[model samples]
Target: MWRLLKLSRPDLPLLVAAFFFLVLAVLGETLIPHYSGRVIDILGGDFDPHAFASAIFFMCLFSFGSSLSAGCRGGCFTYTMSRINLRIREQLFSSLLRQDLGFFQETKTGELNSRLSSDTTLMSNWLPLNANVLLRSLVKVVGLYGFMLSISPRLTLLSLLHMPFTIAAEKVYNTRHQEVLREIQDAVARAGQVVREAVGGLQTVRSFGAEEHEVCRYKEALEQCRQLYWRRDLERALYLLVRRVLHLGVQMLMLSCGLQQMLTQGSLLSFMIYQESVGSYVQTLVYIYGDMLSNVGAAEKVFSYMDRQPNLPSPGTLAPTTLQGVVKFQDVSFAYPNRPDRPVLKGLTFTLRPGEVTALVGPNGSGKSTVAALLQNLYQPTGGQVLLDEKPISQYEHCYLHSQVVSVGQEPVLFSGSVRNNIAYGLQSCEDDKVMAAAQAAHADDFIQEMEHGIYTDVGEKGSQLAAGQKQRLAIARALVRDPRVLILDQATSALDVQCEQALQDWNSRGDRTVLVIAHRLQTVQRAHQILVLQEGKLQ
Candidate 1:
C-alpha cells in the first residue's frame, strides 16, 4: 500500500487530513446517540425548554461537524485515489518501456493489460478509503469499549462473550476469501484471453467462418467468471448473515439486562439511557470492525502484485562515452525461458564492423530476428557476451544504445502523427531540408510531395490509411533521419514490390554506417561484405 501511495507523493497532505477527519467523524457520530439518550431521559421528566433547546443546538452542531468531516473525507479520498491511480498507470507504462522482450514473452499481453488496468484499479479501491476505514474502525472499537466499561464493567464483559468465536470465524472466512480472490482473478484473466484472441485473430475467424465457435468459447469463459464470483459471494453472504445475527443478539441481551436493573433497583431513567447509549455505540463499533476485517483479503492481493519484482532489471550505470558502432557476438547461445534446454543461437559468433554491411539471410524462425534482438540488448545470451566497441553491451545505458543503434522492422509502426513528426521522431532538433533529404534517400519524397500537406500529412492510426509500400517508405525515412551508427534493417522493405526493393537496395549500398539486413531477396545480400546464413538458431 505504501508503494502505491509513494507514486503520488503530492497527495501525502490530503492523506494525513483524511486520517484526521475520519477519526473526528467517527468520534462525532459516537456522541450523537449519547446526546439523544440524555434528551429522552430529560423529556420523560418535568418539561425544561431551556435544556431541550440546548440539546437541539448541540445536535445541530454535531450534525454540521459530521457533514464537514464527510466533505473532507470525500475530497481527500477522490483526489488522493485519482492521483494514486494515475501514478500507478504512469509507472507501469514507464517500466514497460524499459523492459526487455523476455518480459513480454514470459507474460502474455492480455495478462499484462489486466495487471495495468483491472489489477491496479482493484488496488486503488483498497488504498485511502479501505485503509482509512480499517484505521477508523480500530479507534472506534477501542473508544466505545472504554465507554462501555464506564457504564457497567460486568455487562461489557458479558457483551463480549462471543468475541473469540467471531474472531475464529473471521480468520477462517478471510483465508477462504483470499483463495476465492485468486480464483476470481484467474477467471477474469481467462475471460479476457478469449476476447483478446478473438479480436487479434478476427481475420482468421472471418475467413474460416468460426464466429459461432469463437462466441461459444467467449461465453464459456464468461460463465466461468460468473461461477467464480458466485462462489465467493456465497461465502461472503454466509459470513455476513452469521455476523449480523450474533451482533443483533448481543444488542438485545444488553437491552434486556439494562431494563432488568432499572426495574429491580428503581434506577434513574438517566442511568438506563446511558446504558442504552453505550450499547448502540458498541454495536456500531462491532459493525465497523467487521467491515474492516472482511477486506483483509483485498489488501493482501494488492500488496502481492505491487511486491512483484521485474524479471529483467536495467543496469544501474552506463559508460560515459558514446558507442563506436562495432558490435561482436562471441560464441553466443540462447534459448527461450520456456525452452531453456533447447538453444536458439548455438555458438553464434559474428562481428559487425563500422562502415560495412552485414546481411543475415534466413527463413522464418531461423534465429535472425533473435540475433537482432540480442544486438539491441533486448535479450542477453544464455552463453557468451555481446560486446559493443569492445565493451560489454550490458554496460551501456538502454537510451544511449537505442540512440546509437536503430532497427526498422518488416511491419511499419507509425503513431498517429504528421509525416514530419514520424520521420523526425528520434531527432531532438531537426530541419525541413534535413527531413526532405532523408525522405529523398528513402525514395519517399515524391509520394510525400503529392500529398496536400506534403511532409506535414497525418499518418492516421498506425498509418492504416496509407498503402503498405508507402508505410515502409515512411519507416525508412524515419530511420534515415536518425542517422544511427548501427542500423539493423529486419525486413524493412519486405512488404514493398520487387522494383521498390531494388530501389531500396541501391540506396542501401551508398550508406557508410554499419548496416545489418535480414531479407528474403538474395540480391540484397549479394553485395554485403559479410553474409550470415542462420537456420534453426544456428549459423548454417
Candidate 2:
C-alpha cells in the first residue's frame, strides 16, 4: 500500500488541505443533528421569537459550511488523483520499454495495456481519493455516536447490537469483490488481446478469410466477461439486503426502549434521527478498509512487472574511441531457448576484417540468420565468444555498440511518420543535405522527391503505404545514415533494383567498414572477398 502511494509525493500540499476540509465537512455533518435537537428543544420550551431565529440561524450556518467545505475537499482530492494517475502510468511505460525483447516475448499486449490503463488507475485511486472518503466516514461515525450517547445512553448501547453482524458480512463481501475484480480484469485483457490480434493481423485474417471465426472467439471471451459482471452485482445485491434487515431490526428495538423509558418528545425525535444513519457510517468505516486492501490487490499485479529484474545484463562501460570493426566468431555455438538440445550454430569459427565484404550463404534452416543475430548481440553465444575489436560485444556500451554496428533485416520496419523521420530515425542532428545524401545513396531519394512533401512524406505503419522496394530502400538509407563500422544486411538487398544493387558496392568502398551480407543475388556473391557456405549447423 505504501509502495503505491509514493506516487503522490508532489500532492503533499493538496492532500493536507483536502483532509482539513474533509474534517470541517465532518464537523458540520455531525453538528447538524445536534442542532435538529436544538430546534426542537427551543420550540418545546419558552416561545421567544429571538431565540427561535438564533436557533434556526445556527442550523443553516452549519449546513452551509459543511456544503462549502465538502465541495473544496472534492475538488482538491480529485485534481490530485488525476495528476498522480498520469504520472504513474507514464513511469510504468518507461520501465517496460527499458526491459529486454525477451521480456515481451512471453507477455501479451492486452495484459500490458491492462496494467498501464487499468491497474495504474486502480492504485492511484486507493490512496489519494478513496482514503479521503474513509477518513471522513470514520470521523462522522464517531461524532454521530458521541451526540447519540449524550441524548440517551440506553439507545446508544442498542445501536451496538448490529456491529458484529455488519462487520462479519463486510468481510465476506470484500474478499469476493476483490477476487472477482481480479478475474474480470484478466478477462477484459484476454478480450483486448483478441481485438489486437485481429486488427494487427488483418492481412492474415483477410487472406485466411477467417473473419467470422475471429468474431466468434471475441464474442466467447466477452460472454465470459459478462458472466463475471453478473456475479459481482448479484453478490452486492444479497449483501445489501442483509444490512437493511439488520438495520430495521435494530431501529425497531431502539424505538421500543425510547417509548418505555418515557423520554421527552424532542429527545425521542432527535435520537431517532441521529440513529438513522449510524449503521451507514459504521458500515462505510469498516468496509472502506477492506476496499482499500482490494485496490492494493490490483496494485500488486501492476508492480509485479515494475519490480521485475531484467534477464539481460546491463551494457558495460567499454566504448573505445576508435574501432577497427574486425569481428570474430571464436569457435561459437548457439541454441534457441525453446530447443536447447538442437544447436543452431555448432563450432563455427569465422573472422570479418575491415575494408572487406563477407557473403554468408546457406540453405534454409542453416545458421546464416543465427550468425547475424549473434553479431548484433541479440543473443550471446553458448560456447566461446563473438567479439568486436577483441572485446566481447556485450562488454561495449549499448549506445556505442549499436552506433558502431547496424543491421537492416529482411523485413524492414518503419514507424508511422514522415519520410524524413524514417530516414533519420535515431540521428540526433541529421541535416537535410545528409538525409538526402543517404537516401540518394540507397536509391530511395527519387521516389521520396516525387511525393508532395518529398523527404517529409509520411511513411505508413511499417511503411505499408509504400511498395516493398521503397520500404527496403528507406531501411537501407536508415542504416547508411549511421555510417556504421560494421553493417549486416540480412536479405535486405534483394528488394533493390539492379542499379542500387551495384550502388551497394560503391558506398562500402569507404575502404574501412566491415560488411556482412546474406545475399540472394549472384552479383552480391561475385563481389565478396570471402564466401562462407553454412550447412546444418557448421560453416564450411
Candidate 3:
C-alpha cells in the first residue's frame, strides 16, 4: 500500500486540501452526537429559550459544517485518485514496451492487457484513497471511544464486546464470499469457452452435423454458472442474518447495562449513539484492513514488472550513417528459451552479400525463420556471431540496425490507419511521393489508386478490412518505403502475381542492396543468385 501511495506524491497539493477538509469534518463528526443528546435533555427539563436555542444552533452548525467539508474532502480525494491511476498506467505501459520480445512470446496477450487495465486499476485505487479512510476511521473511533468512556466506563467497556464478533464474522463472511465469487467466475469461463469453441469450430460442427450437441453443451455450461450464483446469494444471506442476530444481542445488553448503571437520559442516549458509530467505524476498519492487505500483492506484482530490466542487452552507442549490407552467421548455434534441449539452428554458417538475392529454403521445422529472426536481432545467437560490417549486429545502434535491416513475414500485418500511413509506417522523414513510389515498387499502387480516398484510406484494425493480398502489398510497401540496405522476404510474396514478382526481381537493379528471400516457389528459387538449403539445423 505504501509503495502504491508513492505514486500519489505528485498530487500532494490536492491531498493537503483534502486533509484540511477532513479535520473540519471530523470536528463536526465528534460534536454532532454530543449536542444532539444535550437537546434531548434541555427539552425534557425546564425549557429556557436561551439554552434551547443555543443547543439547537450548535448542533446545526456542526451538522452543516461536516456535510460541506465531506463534499470537498470526497471530491479532492477523487481527483487525487484519478491522477494516481493515470500515472500508474502510464508507467506500466512504458515498462511493458521496454520488455524484450521473448517476454511477449512467453506471456499471453490477454494477461498482459488485463494487468495493464484491471490489475493496475486494483493496485492504484485501494491504497491511496483507503489511507484517508483508514485515518478518518481511526481518529473518529478514538474520539468516540473517549467520549463514551466519559459517559460510563463500564458501559463503554461492555459496548466493545461486539468488536470480536464483528471482526470474526466479517472474516468468515468475506472468505466464503470470495470463494463463491471465484467459483462463479470459473463457471462463467466454462460457459464462455463453450461458446468460443463452438463458434470458432463452426465449420467442424456443421460438417459433422453436431449443432444440437453443441447447443446442449453450451446451455449446460451457462446453467452451471447460474446455479453457482444461487449458492453465492444463499451463502451471503445466511451469514448477514447470523451477524445481525449477534448484533441484536449486544445492543440489548448495552440497554440493560446502561439502565442499571443509572446514567442520565441524555447522557445515555449519547453513549448509544457513540456505540453505534464505533461499531460502524470498526467494521470499515476491518474491511479495508483485509482489502488493503490483498492489494499489497497486486501492488508488488505491478512494481516488479515496472522495475524489471530487459533481459536482452542494451542498444550499443554506434549509429553509422551508411552501412554496407554484409551479413554473416559464423557457425551460429541457437535455441528458443523453452526448448533448450532441442537446438533449432546449430553450427550454421552463412553470408549475405550486397548485389545478391540470396534465397534460403528449407523443409518445415528446419530453422529457416530462426535464421531470419537472428538477422533481425529478435534473439541473440547462443554461440558464434551474427555480424554486419564484420561487427556483431548487437553493437550497431538500435534504430540504425532495424532501419537498415527489415524483415517482412509470410502473413504481414498493418496497424489501423490510412493506406499512406501503412506505407510510411516508421520513416518520419518520408515524403508523400516516396510513399507512392514504394507502393508502385511493390506493385500495390493499382488497387491503392482505385480507393475512394486514395492514399488516405483508412484500413480497419490489423488491416482486417483489407484482402490477404492487399495486406501483404501494404506490408511490402512498408518495407520498401524504408529503402533498407538488407531486405528479408521470408515467404513474404506468396500472394503477389507474376508482375509483383517481376517488380521485386528488378528492385535491386541498382546492385547496391542485399536481399534474403525465403520461399518454396520455383519461379523465385530458380532466379536467386544463391540458394542455401537448410536441413536438420545445418545450412547446405
Candidate 4:
C-alpha cells in the first residue's frame, strides 16, 4: 500500500486534500454524537432554558461541521481518485504500447485488459476508504475510550473487559476472510477467461449451435463466483453477530454496576452519556472493519499485477542507431514458451543480404512464421544470435529495429481511422501523395478511391468493413509507406485473390529494397529470388 502511494506521489497534492477533509469529516461526525449525548444528559438533569439553548446550538454546529467536511471530502475524493485511476490506466496503456511482441505472447490479451481496467478500479476503491478509515478509526476508538474513562473509571474498565474477546474473534475472522478473498480472486479470473473465450469464438459457437454449452460454462463460472461471495458473507455475519452479542453483554454489565453506584450515591448522567458515545464509536469501528476486510481481495489483485515483471527486460541503454538491412542468424534455436522442450527453430542459420529477397516456405508448424518473428525481434532465440547490419539484433534499440524492419502479418489489422492515417502510421511527416502512391503500389488505390470519401473514409475497427483482400492490400500499403529497409511478408498475401496478389507483385518490381517473404503457397514462393524450406524446427 505504501508502495502504491510512493509510485503515485506525483499526484499527492490532490490525494492529500482528499484525505485531509476526509479526516475532518470523521472527526466532526464523532463530535456530533458526543454533543448529542451531552444534550440528552443535560435535558435529563435540571435543565435551564439557557443551557438547553446552548446545547442545541452546539449540536447544530457539529452537524454543520460534519456536513461541510463531508461535502469537501466527496469533492476531494472525486478529484484524487479520478486522477489516480486515470494516471494508472494511462501508464498501463503506455506500457502496453511500448511492450514488444514477446510480452503479448506470454500474457493473454484479456488478462492484460483486466489488469489495466478491473484491477486498477479495485485498487482505486482501496485508496480513499482504506487510507481514511485506518487513520480515523484508530483516533476515534482511542478518544472514545479516554472520554469513557474520565466519566467513571470503574464502569469504563468493566466495559473494556470484553475487548480482548472481540479482538480474538476479529483475528480469527480475519484469517478466514483472507481465504475467502483468495477464492473470490480465482473465481473472478475464471469468469474473465470464460467471457473472453465466448466473445472471441462467438462465430464458432453459433455455427456449431453450442450456445447451450457456452451458457452452461458461463453459469458454472457465475456459480463459482456466487459461492465465494456467499462464503465471505457467512463468515462476516457470524463474526459480527458474536461480537455484537459480546458487546451487549458488556453493556449490560456496565449498566447494572452503574445503577448500583447511583442508588448508593448520587446520580451520574455523565457516565451514561460517555457509555453511549463509546457504544456508538464501537459500532462505527465494526462497520469500518467490515468494509476494510471486504476490499482485501481487490487490493491483492491490483498489487499482484503491478508487481509482475516483463518476461524480457528492456535494454538499459539505447542500442546501435544505424541499420543497413543485413540480417544473419548463427545456429539459432528457439522454442515457444508454452512448449519449451519442442524447438520451433533448431540450428537454423541464414543470411539476408541488403537489397535482396529471401523467401521462407514450409507446411504448418514448419517454423516459417517463427523465423519471421525472430527477424522482427518478436522472439529471442534460445541459442545463438541474430545480427542486423553486423551488430547483434539485441543491441539494436527496439524502436529503431521495429521501424527499420516492418513485417505485415498474415492478417491485416486496421484501426478505426482514415485510410491515409493507417498507411502513414510509421512515417513521420508523410504527405498525401506519398500515401496515395504507396496505396497505388499495393493496388489498394483503386478500391480506396471507390469509397465515398476516398482515402479519408473511416475504416471500422480492424477494417471490419473492408473485404479481407482489401484489408491485406491496405496493410501492404501501410508497410510500403514506411519505406523500411527490410520488409517482411509473413503470408501477408494469403488472404488476397491470385489476381490481386499478382498485381501487388508487379508493383514491387519498381522498388530496390530487401524483402523477406514467408508463404506456403507455391505461386507466392515461386516469385522469390531464393527460398528456404523448414521442417519441424530445422532448416532444410
TM-score leader:
2
Among the numbered candidates, top lDDT falls to 2
Provide the lDDT at 319 for model 1. 54
**TM-score winner between candidates 2 and 3:** 2
Pick the winner on TM-score between candidates 1 and 3: 1
Q: Model 4 over residues 14-84: C-alpha lDDT tens digits?
A: 76777787877887887787778878887466666688888889889888988887788777777777888
Candidate order by TM-score, decreasing, is 2, 4, 1, 3
Which residue runs does candidate 4 get wrong by more than 4 Å? Answer: 14-66, 96-107, 126-143, 146-163, 166-168, 248-273, 276-298, 313-322, 506-512, 523-527
Give the TM-scores of the predictions, in the order they appear: 0.82, 0.88, 0.80, 0.84
| Per-residue lDDT of model 2, residues 203-236, tens digit only | 9899999999999999999999999999988987
- State the local distance difference test value for candidate 2: 0.82
Give the clashing pairs for model 3.
Answer: none
Question: Where does model 2 exceed 4 Å of error?
Answer: 32-64, 125-129, 147-173, 243-276, 521-523
- Candidate 1 residue 226 Cα shift, in angstroms, is 1.5
- Per-residue accuracy of model 1 over 1-540 as CA lDDT, tens digit each: 345445667787988888788878877887888888766778566656688878878988997898799789878898888888788777666667654555567667776676677766765665555565566656654654454424555554555664554667766876787777777777777778778888877778999999999899989988888998899889888977786676556556655776666433444233445444554455455555554454444545445545556566557367556556788999999887756787888898889887778899888878888888888877778799998888888887766777777889867799888999999986678999989999998889888878878888888877876999899999998888877888999889778888878777743454557889888867667778888888887887
The residue ranges of model 3 lying beyond 4 angstroms of the native Cα positions read 33-61, 124-133, 147-284, 298-301
Tell me the TM-score of model 1.
0.82
lDDT per model vs. reference: 0.75, 0.82, 0.79, 0.74
Lowest-scoring 10 consecutive residues by lDDT in candidate 1?
Answer: 262-271
- Once superposed on the true structure, which residue ranges of model 1 sit more than 4 Å away at CA? 1-10, 19-62, 126-156, 200-204, 245-324, 507-511
